[PDB]
Amino acid sequence: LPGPDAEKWYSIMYPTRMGTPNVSKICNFVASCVRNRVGRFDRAQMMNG
Amino acid sequence: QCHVCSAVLFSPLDLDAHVASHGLHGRHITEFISSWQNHPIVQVSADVENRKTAQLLHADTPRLVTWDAGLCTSFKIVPIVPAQVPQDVLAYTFFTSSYAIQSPFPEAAVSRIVVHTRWASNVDFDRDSSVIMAPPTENNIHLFKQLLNTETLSVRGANPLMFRANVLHMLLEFVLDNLYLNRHTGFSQDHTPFTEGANLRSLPGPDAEKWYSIMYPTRMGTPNVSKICNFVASCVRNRVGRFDRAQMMNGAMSEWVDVFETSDALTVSIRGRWMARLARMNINPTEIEWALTECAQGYVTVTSPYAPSVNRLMPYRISNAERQISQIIRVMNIGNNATVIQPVLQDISVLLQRISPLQIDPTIISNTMSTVSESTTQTLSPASSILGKLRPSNSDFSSFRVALAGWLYNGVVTTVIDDSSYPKDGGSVTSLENLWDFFILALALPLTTDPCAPVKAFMTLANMMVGFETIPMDNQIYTQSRRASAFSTPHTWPRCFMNIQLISPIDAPILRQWAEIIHRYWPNPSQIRYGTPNVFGSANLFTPPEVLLLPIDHQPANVTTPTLDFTNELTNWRARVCELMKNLVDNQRYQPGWTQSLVSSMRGTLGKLKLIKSMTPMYLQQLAPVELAVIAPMLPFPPFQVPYVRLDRDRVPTMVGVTRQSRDTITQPALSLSTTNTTVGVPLALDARAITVALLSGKYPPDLVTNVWYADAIYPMYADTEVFSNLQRDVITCEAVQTLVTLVAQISETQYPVDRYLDWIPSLRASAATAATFAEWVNTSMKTAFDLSDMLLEPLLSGDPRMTQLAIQYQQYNGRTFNVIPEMPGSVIADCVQLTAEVFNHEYNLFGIARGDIIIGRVQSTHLWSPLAPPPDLVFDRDTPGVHIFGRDCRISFGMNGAAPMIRDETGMMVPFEGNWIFPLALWQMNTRYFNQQFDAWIKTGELRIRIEMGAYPYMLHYYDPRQYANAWNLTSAWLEEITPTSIPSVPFMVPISSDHDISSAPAVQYIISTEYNDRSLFCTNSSSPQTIAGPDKHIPVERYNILTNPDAPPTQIQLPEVVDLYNVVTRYAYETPPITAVVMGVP
Amino acid sequence: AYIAVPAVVDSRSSEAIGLLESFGVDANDVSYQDHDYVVDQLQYMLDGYEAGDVIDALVYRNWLHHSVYCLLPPKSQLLEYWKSNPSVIPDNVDRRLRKRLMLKKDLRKDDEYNQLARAFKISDVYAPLISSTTSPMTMIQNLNQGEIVYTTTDRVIGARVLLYAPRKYYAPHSRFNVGTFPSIA
Ligand SMILES: [Zn+2]
């Protein structure tokens, strides 16, 4: 997503992308979820280019 | 002077330079000489410093025939930690002289094989794609970070998700560096007491004794007791030097020989395949003169003399299928860019003017109508109106010859008559000016390649007659007064046009007659033969491979036809249009307000205009299709035609698209760029004015002889042909298409199954942005290898290059389509990449890749076992009892009040920091700088032993003295601190140095060991001593030198996928490549 | 690319002002157009016509299709200039009318010239032609076609006006372009 400062939105925008080091509550939540539900999963490509 | 091709050359002492081109033993691309004039034409390459009135070829031809005089090997053996020993007998004494002992292998303590392709080579025009590997002490990681980790967190490593793409691309470069032909060279018989009577080859250079020890291992005798002197004593003696030779010669040098020298079985297999591909391609000058006779339409013959020789190799014959694939790529190059087709059509429009005998002189109209003046009293006058509208002072007739050139290229471009050549805002037949505008329009309409030109011709008069006579329509919204410019598509043709009986003559008699004249006398399409089958191929599709269909009936060409011939189609058309116009004017039913009676003047200036002398309708049916069919094979973008119809909206093409995916797969519909046009191609506008005056005024020269004019016009444009280069370009184009569709399918997921050799190297299922930059990186490697600065393989990159097979189709109006799927022949570079991938599957070690995985764990021992070949005690797997497998959700809880901190395995249980574990490498890459905090104090001191499963990894060695103390922690921890999430550095190993005498035992600390056997790269240890006592022991690999040590082995036999062989049997050639000569003889 | 800013932009002066960092844009490839004359041309344009026709005509004009006007003396000085020293008469002319113009010392007594001159129109030779009764929409719509437009009057809006006769008869892009009128075409 565009903007002047965009390298910190991804941690906010994808919770399941984070690694899981600890038994902190965030890391107990994140590692107890489904992995293949991140990013794109459907598009409609009607023309080349 | 030459008595073979009748060439006139002035000095009788450089005649050998000319008659070497005829195959006679005593630079240019082609050399033609005429038969009636002293004017030869020479065509030379495009990088020159001057020209001797010589023409050029602006064709990006590839370099197919490149020569190699050096060794045909790519592996080399380097010394590493060298040593010297005291020896016995030091030199050979003959009488007084002493000859030192040269060795075929480096006398070192350790020696192992690395890869530096073309390391003994003397080519011209290097391919500029090498695979250079340092010895494994140095860092070989710059090869694997080559493309795809352009953004990387750490510049001191390599991305493990891109290992497959990088290894596969350097297999491609390893193939592309071996596309040469071996060169015959001079020999030298010796009489040394170990190579007695053999004919050893001498490399081209000042020295010859230097390379003999490297090439021929048995020449060094057995002076003392060594591993090398044991191997050579085990070898045989008869097979050395030249095996046999050819029978045909030129003097004393035979044509082809075969030698027994240090080489690679893989490299000679690749060069044998590249030899066979060029051998399946050549042609003789008998077929050259056949093709250039047949292509010239019989107006000129051609002959090309030559001496009988097997040395000829002129690679020009390609299959018919590859021209079609190159045609599809050249169509996809356009992409609705108006820029890339304007110098295609304007250029042929100039060339047809330069060839054509027709001189369009518009003063014929002014000479017929200068005598027609009018009285001084009345205002409006038809003869002055037509001249003010035609304007014969303007002399720019480019709109005529662009229309003549556009007949070859419907489908990529369609020509229409421009707006503001129609009547302004209606037209209203009461007006004087719009009648002449209708005439100039309707006479010029039959030459556009527009499928709706008859409906435009009908609806123009239907617009002009609004209010006087009415026709029925269908839907009450497309009224009769809808502009004829809008009728551009087949779904706008009305019912009243397609059925004449709805137009009632009691209401619309002139509309009835105008529809009937269009349905009878509109010109009929036809087709004409051209080019050559069986030479030059045929680059067209949707048509038969030899016919050229064009919308005019053509006739056999003579000269003395009558001018007023109404069997001629266009003259019939002009006569019918003038007859309906003087039927329109005759009654004055349509023009009130004319205060005079202009019927006499109008009918007179139509009668003087109908029977005008004009050789253009004779020309367009007799000599213009001949001139199209002559220059049609010589074009750089060969014609691409879609079939012509008339008055039939069931076979009218509406849409041309290029299908990229396969046939039995259902994917996203990725329609090409070319399908988004209203008409069938790019719309091109033309002026009807300068088409009409070019029809009305045209004459021949008054001494026109066709057998002189065409035999003189054909010669300088065949003398600058480039079809012979455009044939060679298309092999490379089809091979690049096949190389992309194999090598992208290796890493992505698709439905193109080819044999899937390497899978143990890890990667990721690449999406479009990854596969496209990988394919661009294939493209820019192949253009570098073949010296191609023009476009190649680039239209297959805008979008999704995850592709299977090229195809192209159009649809007609009623819904049916026509699908042309060009089948593929065998491709050489693609299956040679497949072959070297099969070789790499067994010889991963020699390129610096290690297979398997590593085990990080402390080993405190004084043993000597070289941690690339571990004993089975230290390794463990998922079958070993008591081994914890860790999945992704590994979580660490710290211990409280003196408890041990624990970690979660895959099955949920918490285990202490102890024992035998199995990570995947993704866990350490996720949680580096965190696992690095807790695990190091347990690995370094405690009893934690971790197996990082990874499949493939680069490695570098660090040899140490095994009689001193050695700690591997400063290397192991430095490897562990640098594993960033996007990259990993090469795995450092600490392996000992073998020795000759027995040594002192010192303690050694090791942390990183391998799992499986991991040095097939190791060649020999201590290759000067009698034996290796302590350390790793490795003799000379006898299976790589197969044909010496094996008695019951034929010389041809190799084992290709299992282990590559050194000292193979390579055949060397020495060819000619004469330029294409031809004597062009005119025909009476 | 063509963006529009709310200020008068000339190529030679607003670069010296800068004029784009003044709106707050940090910034070659930015080529300035000269929209100095169109504002005065608009001010002369507004006093005759209404507002909405003039504005809604000027809105539909791209500023990359480069073109120009042409202004000619009305009818009498138009035929008089062809009578004069240049024989620069176009090929659209009547065959009899150019023949009567190539002679010497024409006057009112010539019936054969005057009869044809009183039925001669400028719209016969020059097309497309802006007359004073044309809407402002069709001026710009005809201007976006063919790189030169013949007029009769001064009161036009759009590109630069250049003249056809001497006054004795009258009464370069880049990638990023800025301007002061938003285009829609
Ligand atoms: Zn000769």
UniProtKB/TrEMBL annotation, chain B:
<dbReference type="GO" id="GO:0039616">
    <property type="term" value="C:T=2 icosahedral viral capsid"/>
</dbReference>
<keyword id="KW-0862">Zinc</keyword>
<feature type="domain" description="C2H2-type">
    <location>
        <begin position="2"/>
        <end position="22"/>
    </location>
</feature>
<protein>
    <submittedName>
        <fullName>Lambda-1 protein</fullName>
    </submittedName>
</protein>
<feature type="binding site">
    <location>
        <position position="22"/>
    </location>
    <ligand>
        <name>Zn(2+) 1</name>
    </ligand>
</feature>
<keyword id="KW-0378">Hydrolase</keyword>
<comment type="function">
    <text>Inner capsid protein that self-assembles to form an icosahedral capsid with a T=2 symmetry, which consists of 120 copies of VP2, with channels at each of its five-fold vertices. This capsid constitutes the innermost concentric layer of the viral mature particle.</text>
</comment>
<dbReference type="InterPro" id="IPR044949">
    <property type="entry name" value="Lambda-1/VP3_sf"/>
</dbReference>
<keyword id="KW-0507">mRNA processing</keyword>
<keyword id="KW-0946">Virion</keyword>
<feature type="binding site">
    <location>
        <position position="22"/>
    </location>
    <ligand>
        <name>Zn(2+) 2</name>
    </ligand>
</feature>
<feature type="binding site">
    <location>
        <position position="4"/>
    </location>
    <ligand>
        <name>Zn(2+) 1</name>
    </ligand>
</feature>
<keyword id="KW-0506">mRNA capping</keyword>
<dbReference type="InterPro" id="IPR054176">
    <property type="entry name" value="Lamba1_VP3"/>
</dbReference>
<keyword id="KW-0067">ATP-binding</keyword>
<feature type="binding site">
    <location>
        <position position="2"/>
    </location>
    <ligand>
        <name>Zn(2+) 1</name>
    </ligand>
</feature>
<keyword id="KW-1153">Inner capsid protein</keyword>
<keyword id="KW-1141">T=2 icosahedral capsid protein</keyword>
<dbReference type="Pfam" id="PF22033">
    <property type="entry name" value="Lamba1_VP3"/>
</dbReference>
<feature type="binding site">
    <location>
        <position position="5"/>
    </location>
    <ligand>
        <name>Zn(2+) 2</name>
    </ligand>
</feature>
<dbReference type="GO" id="GO:0006370">
    <property type="term" value="P:7-methylguanosine mRNA capping"/>
</dbReference>
<keyword id="KW-0547">Nucleotide-binding</keyword>
TrEMBL record, chain C:
<protein>
    <submittedName>
        <fullName>Mu-2 protein</fullName>
    </submittedName>
</protein>
